[PDB]
Scaffold this active site. Structure first.
Site, PDB file in Angstrom:
ATOM      1  N   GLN A 128      40.291  63.272  22.154  1.00 20.89           N
ATOM      2  CA  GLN A 128      39.141  64.067  21.731  1.00 20.89           C
ATOM      3  C   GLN A 128      39.528  65.405  21.164  1.00 20.89           C
ATOM      4  O   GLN A 128      38.863  65.896  20.244  1.00 20.89           O
ATOM      5  CB  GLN A 128      38.197  64.241  22.924  1.00 20.89           C
ATOM      6  CG  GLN A 128      36.827  64.728  22.531  1.00 20.89           C
ATOM      7  CD  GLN A 128      35.971  65.011  23.745  1.00 20.89           C
ATOM      8  OE1 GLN A 128      36.462  65.161  24.863  1.00 20.89           O
ATOM      9  NE2 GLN A 128      34.673  65.030  23.536  1.00 20.89           N
ATOM     10  N   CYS A 156      38.480  59.046  32.932  1.00 22.55           N
ATOM     11  CA  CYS A 156      38.250  60.277  33.692  1.00 22.55           C
ATOM     12  C   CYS A 156      36.742  60.544  33.690  1.00 22.55           C
ATOM     13  O   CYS A 156      35.994  59.971  34.499  1.00 22.55           O
ATOM     14  CB  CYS A 156      38.984  61.500  33.135  1.00 22.55           C
ATOM     15  SG  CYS A 156      38.580  63.108  34.061  1.00 22.55           S
ATOM     16  N   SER A 157      36.295  61.386  32.754  1.00 19.81           N
ATOM     17  CA  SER A 157      34.898  61.765  32.628  1.00 19.81           C
ATOM     18  C   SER A 157      34.159  61.031  31.507  1.00 19.81           C
ATOM     19  O   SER A 157      33.260  60.235  31.782  1.00 19.81           O
ATOM     20  CB  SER A 157      34.779  63.279  32.400  1.00 19.81           C
ATOM     21  OG  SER A 157      33.413  63.620  32.419  1.00 19.81           O
ATOM     22  N   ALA A 158      34.481  61.310  30.246  1.00 19.46           N
ATOM     23  CA  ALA A 158      33.780  60.661  29.144  1.00 19.46           C
ATOM     24  C   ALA A 158      34.396  59.330  28.714  1.00 19.46           C
ATOM     25  O   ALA A 158      33.762  58.568  27.973  1.00 19.46           O
ATOM     26  CB  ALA A 158      33.727  61.595  27.939  1.00 19.46           C
ATOM     27  N   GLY A 159      35.589  59.027  29.165  1.00 23.64           N
ATOM     28  CA  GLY A 159      36.271  57.816  28.802  1.00 23.64           C
ATOM     29  C   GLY A 159      36.955  57.853  27.468  1.00 23.64           C
ATOM     30  O   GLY A 159      37.260  56.784  26.933  1.00 23.64           O
ATOM     31  N   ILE A 160      37.165  59.037  26.889  1.00 24.79           N
ATOM     32  CA  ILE A 160      37.750  59.102  25.548  1.00 24.79           C
ATOM     33  C   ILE A 160      38.960  60.025  25.402  1.00 24.79           C
ATOM     34  O   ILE A 160      39.929  59.664  24.699  1.00 24.79           O
ATOM     35  CB  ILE A 160      36.685  59.477  24.486  1.00 24.79           C
ATOM     36  CG1 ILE A 160      36.061  60.847  24.746  1.00 24.79           C
ATOM     37  CG2 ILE A 160      35.560  58.454  24.433  1.00 24.79           C
ATOM     38  CD1 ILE A 160      35.185  61.330  23.583  1.00 24.79           C
ATOM     39  N   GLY A 161      38.964  61.182  26.066  1.00 24.86           N
ATOM     40  CA  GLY A 161      40.014  62.144  25.748  1.00 24.86           C
ATOM     41  C   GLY A 161      41.336  61.903  26.452  1.00 24.86           C
ATOM     42  O   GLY A 161      42.339  61.503  25.835  1.00 24.86           O
ATOM     43  N   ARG A 162      41.338  62.157  27.761  1.00 20.34           N
ATOM     44  CA  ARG A 162      42.487  61.840  28.595  1.00 20.34           C
ATOM     45  C   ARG A 162      42.771  60.351  28.567  1.00 20.34           C
ATOM     46  O   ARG A 162      43.935  59.943  28.543  1.00 20.34           O
ATOM     47  CB  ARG A 162      42.234  62.289  30.034  1.00 20.34           C
ATOM     48  CG  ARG A 162      41.929  63.741  30.142  1.00 20.34           C
ATOM     49  CD  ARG A 162      41.597  64.112  31.558  1.00 20.34           C
ATOM     50  NE  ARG A 162      41.146  65.503  31.688  1.00 20.34           N
ATOM     51  CZ  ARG A 162      40.883  66.066  32.860  1.00 20.34           C
ATOM     52  NH1 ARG A 162      41.047  65.404  33.995  1.00 20.34           N
ATOM     53  NH2 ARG A 162      40.444  67.315  32.902  1.00 20.34           N
ATOM     54  N   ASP A 208      46.109  71.708  32.295  1.00 19.10           N
ATOM     55  CA  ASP A 208      45.216  72.597  31.551  1.00 19.10           C
ATOM     56  C   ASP A 208      45.827  72.974  30.220  1.00 19.10           C
ATOM     57  O   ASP A 208      45.221  72.793  29.154  1.00 19.10           O
ATOM     58  CB  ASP A 208      44.946  73.852  32.383  1.00 19.10           C
ATOM     59  CG  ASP A 208      44.010  74.836  31.692  1.00 19.10           C
ATOM     60  OD1 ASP A 208      43.567  74.574  30.555  1.00 19.10           O
ATOM     61  OD2 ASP A 208      43.729  75.885  32.297  1.00 19.10           O
TER      62      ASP A 208
END
EC number: 3.1.3.48
Length: 282
Positions: A261, A217-223, A182
């Site tokens: 991101q 993960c979720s959007a495919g961009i940040g992590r 986090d």
């Protein structure tokens, strides 16, 4: 491509200057795609986030079940270049949603993908990644997926998986990283660095011209962008004695809009590279 080559000393201080990091970071164009680039009824049903779309030049196209239907062939995924520009080292993609789980496994099979890296916390298995693997066995548009073994480590679970389709069996390693932080402070860097190093060793075990590694993960961009940028810069550091996180991020953004991101994510890559430089210097 912008560029800021960091030598050891500069990298450690850079990681600790959040004002310079955000100044630099928010100068980098997102390179998000105009949605009016995909006039395709129903496309939104295949997208987790309606304005995170795959840039067309690098997007993964599925050749099933009907290659002639532009929706059947669509997945929110992009080929991502590796260190030095190597093509198709990774695929960055959103966490599958209920309506795209078969599409995801279709892409795994079509791309001969040997490794998946999932950076979605146990807590976030609600609307961030649909469980898409079985407890033991499942099948999607032709592909028998079987979980053969589950190896637990301190910061990831590795599933050893077999894919049967007709008479072909292939192996697959699914890395489920569980320690995404986090607060992106330096004491959270070591597990990410560990995961990057383990995946690279797994990838090299595949031999020459490794097929694409799927990261999500979720959007495919940040992590996803953090993990790939860290992978790229670890090679760069070992090979060149420096890191160029800004240039690497630019490379990533060219492949897929939004890669890395947030500024917290950008600083985190810096913490991770600073940690690794220190590890290498002792």
């Amino acid at each position: 491509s912008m560029s800021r080559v960091l030598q050891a000393e500069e990298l450690h201080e850079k990681a600790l200057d959040p004002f310079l990091l955000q100044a630099e970071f928010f100068e980098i164009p997102m390179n998000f795609v105009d949605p009016k680039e995909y006039d395709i009824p129903g496309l939104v049903r295949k997208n987790r986030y309606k304005t995170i779309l795959p840039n067309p030049h690098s997007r993964v196209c599925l050749t099933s079940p009907d290659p002639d239907d532009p929706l059947s062939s669509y997945i929110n995924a992009n080929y991502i270049r590796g260190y030095g520009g190597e093509e198709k080292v990774y695929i960055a993609t959103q966490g599958p949603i209920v309506s795209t789980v078969a599409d995801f496994w279709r892409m795994v099979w079509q791309e001969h993908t040997p490794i998946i890296v999932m950076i979605t916390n146990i807590e976030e298995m609600n609307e961030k990644c649909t469980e898409y693997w079985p407890e033991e066995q499942v099948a999607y548009d032709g592909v028998e997926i079987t979980v053969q073994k589950v190896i637990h480590t301190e910061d990831y679970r590795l599933r050893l998986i077999s894919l049967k389709s007709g008479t072909e069996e292939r192996g697959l390693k699914h890395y489920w990283f569980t320690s995404w932080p986090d607060q992106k402070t330096p004491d959270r860097a070591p597990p990410l660095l560990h995961l990057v190093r383990e995946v690279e060793e797994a990838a090299q075990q595949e031999g020459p011209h490794c097929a694409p590694i799927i990261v999500h993960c979720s959007a495919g961009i940040g992590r996803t962008g953090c993990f790939i940028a860290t992978s790229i810069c670890c090679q760069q550091l070992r090979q060149e004695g420096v890191v160029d996180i800004l240039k690497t991020t630019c490379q990533l953004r060219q492949d897929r809009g939004g890669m890395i991101q947030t500024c917290e994510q950008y600083q985190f890559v810096h913490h991770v590279m600073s940690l690794y430089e220190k590890q290498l210097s002792h």
